[PDB]
Design a protein around this ligand. Structure first.
Ligand code: CU
Ligand code: CU
Ligand code: CU
Ligand code: CU
Ligand code: CU
Ligand code: CU
Ligand code: OH
Ligand code: OH
Lengths: 439, 439
């Protein structure tokens, strides 16, 4: 096979992507071992769905798990009557998701379960896949001539040939695994054939963060979670929190082997210690550095010039309301709150008007990083921690370190009831989620 | 008696104004004739209550009318659990209103009935009186040395020795009367003894407007509905819509007689005509000019200098929501709407958070002037008809001509359910009112 493993791609045909996917326990070879994972389409990751704006997607999910499940079309600005976070597909039953891809949309999105209280074990076990929305911008020479790859960043831990069970501490921190994988492979080698790479990045992990750095190279950010930037932005490193996506250009500078690493990062996970009276919580501190993949540059690399522009960001109407959403923790109880409450599917927390813009101030009063996600309505991050964001682009997850406030500009799109929640999915399952109704 | 009639004053004593007032049909002499009016305290207008900040008011209203009634403490930023627009005092029964006058408050306020559907006939018949909040600012020499008077502007029509009944056309336009009175007197004479007058003005009419102009003189506006301006503002004339108050300084320029007039003003009242097929609505056009009072200046008048400053207007917190409230009419039905609905006491229309500031955009899509009033929460008018307001002061009624939008800055104060409505009281009775809940 190709030196670099990537999920199989399913493309729309004549403007229609019609596909039946089963969610099923699947024996497979993983990182050199045999294991049974929970998969979509018999693979880990699940297949990459590749579509264009205005395509129709018709996805019939068959549930062959011993528990109920459903799908969240993460990042897609479609109707919550389709992307329905309250729907339950019982074991043995099927459901068809049908929607049209929005006209003004591009980038890397993904699908995974969202059945409250069951998300963390289902996602950890292997249920996720990517969805790419191809754009006319992809035809510009500086992108067309680049070598494109998808990198699905997901870790895993195995026990007795199955995903390791969640411990109480896992419910508190979010579960991370020792197998730090790219596209389900352990430290694959990417032998580049072109001097410019276009990499679509997805953090599909439950809780692990990826502080991305390529040895000896900067990255050029060209897209965030939900669309292009207005122009490329040079960065020395790039933090991807759970649920986030990015697209970067890599401009290979000379021949050789360069490691793509997840550098040490302290997200505030906790351990427990007993030192003589003690028996209390202690910081785990920064993650150990991980090598994600080996990048081999071609001979005499001569990278393309960067595109001068990408996509102009929409001029939004003035906002008509400001919201404040405060995140707090009860670590020893593994309970997590928004404005002092846990999720209740029957309770509407915010009520907004479609086609107006809101300002959401999300404040992390906990000690852990929390990556805040809103369904259905992509947002523009204005600032985090009082620092203005250095680009304009659509996002749907925003990471908050301890104490930080994120200010978001949130245009409300499709009508209906939807949710916002922490994308450390253990925290969502344990209560850190609320209901937004748009009318 | 004094050449210039003014309502009797009741003052707080030792920080307490404790008073029993009966609402009662009362035979009295009015404009030279005998009539029976509905009065508070046996007089028309009712007695002027004069208090200071932090005083306690204990007002027991005895209802001696054949129908239920209640009181609205118009303009007072107190609790809607006291200023309760839903309370009904049955015939023969009594209710005690008790509250403390807010610390930061000054100006001319008033009291009148607010029992939905019964306001117009009760107010028209004579049920109203003034409440003055004295301020330390009153001690500055430029105000202290002025000659102060209250002018209650209220019109009346009599039939068979009683207030004229409402016709269907009255319910559509709001009722105006042919007796255009000041303090219940017909064109009284004010023989000034000082060169500077301080006049507190109250429009307590159901629907009549007063486009005020004093012959040969400007007016110096020093207070709006609910408090002082920041400095005096010179004006050539001053429009007082129903429910509005103002305080002005008059600087008498030479000896002589000067008429205070209500100049012609077209508020969009309608009539009906039949010209050969016709049988349709026609504009009444501008009101006929009225003389309100005769002002006699003293000999060799030498007016005080104007105060350089009055009261600095509070710096308000940035607003957290913008509301839009659209007023419309069905004239032939005498039905009046806010955002397409009529009042329903069981339905909450707006829900806001105490101690936040809101921007209210009130838009008149009707053809009549509508003076918009909000209980409990005084506002700062930013602009009307796209014209910035030329001063900062607290108001609680804002007049909108046909097509105009008023932009208001509304700090929400006391918690509870209250109302906003047109202060052409016929329109309120006929549905032009909504419910605000503050929590
Ligand atoms: Cu997600
Ligand atoms: Cu979290
Ligand atoms: Cu979600
Ligand atoms: Cu009033
Ligand atoms: Cu009106
Ligand atoms: Cu009222
Ligand atoms: O999610
Ligand atoms: O009123």
């Amino acid at each position: 096979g190709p030196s670099f493993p990537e999920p199989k791609v399913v493309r729309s045909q004549g403007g229609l992507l019609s596909l039946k996917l089963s969610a099923t326990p699947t024996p497979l070879a993983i990182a050199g071992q045999r294991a049974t994972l929970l998969t979509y389409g018999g693979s880990f990751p699940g297949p990459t769905l590749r579509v264009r704006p205005r395509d129709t997607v018709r996805l019939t999910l068959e549930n062959r798990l011993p528990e109920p499940t459903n799908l969240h079309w993460h990042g897609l600005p479609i109707s919550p009557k389709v992307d329905d976070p309250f729907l339950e597909i019982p074991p043995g039953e099927s459901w068809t998701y049908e929607f049209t891809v929005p006209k003004e949309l591009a980038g890397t999105f993904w699908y995974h379960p969202h059945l409250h209280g069951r998300v963390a074990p289902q996602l950890f076990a292997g249920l996720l896949g990517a969805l790419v929305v191809e754009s006319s911008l992809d035809a510009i020479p500086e992108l067309r001539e680049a070598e494109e790859h998808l990198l699905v960043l997901k870790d895993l831990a195995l026990q007795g040939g199955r995903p390791a069970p969640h411990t109480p501490m896992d419910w508190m921190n979010g579960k991370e695994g020792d197998l730090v994988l790219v596209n389900g492979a352990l430290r694959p080698t990417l032998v580049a054939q072109k001097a410019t790479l276009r990499l679509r990045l997805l953090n599909a992990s439950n809780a692990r963060y990826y502080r991305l750095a390529l040895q000896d190279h900067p990255l050029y950010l060209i897209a965030a979670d939900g669309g292009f930037l207005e122009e490329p932005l040079e960065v020395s490193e790039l933090l991807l929190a759970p649920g986030e996506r990015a697209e970067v250009l890599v401009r290979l500078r000379k021949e050789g082997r360069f490691l793509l690493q997840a550098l040490p990062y302290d997200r505030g996970a906790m351990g427990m210690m007993d030192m003589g009276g003690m028996a209390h919580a202690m910081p785990q501190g920064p993650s150990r550095p991980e090598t994600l993949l080996y990048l081999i540059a071609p001979k005499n690399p001569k990278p393309l010039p960067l595109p001068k522009a990408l996509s102009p960001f929409p001029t939004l109407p003035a906002p008509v309301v400001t919201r404040r959403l405060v995140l707090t923790e009860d670590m020893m109880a593994a309970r997590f709150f928004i404005n002092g409450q846990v999720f209740d599917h029957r309770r509407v927390d915010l009520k907004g008007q479609a086609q107006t813009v809101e300002v959401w101030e999300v404040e992390n009063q906990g000690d852990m990083d929390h990556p805040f996600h809103l369904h259905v309505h992509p947002f523009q991050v204005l600032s985090v921690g009082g620092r203005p964001f250095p680009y304009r682009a659509w996002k749907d997850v925003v990471n908050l370190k301890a104490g930080e406030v994120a200010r978001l500009l949130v245009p409300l799109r499709e009508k209906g009831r939807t949710v916002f929640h922490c994308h450390i999915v253990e925290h969502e399952d344990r209560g850190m989620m609320g209901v937004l109704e748009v009318g």
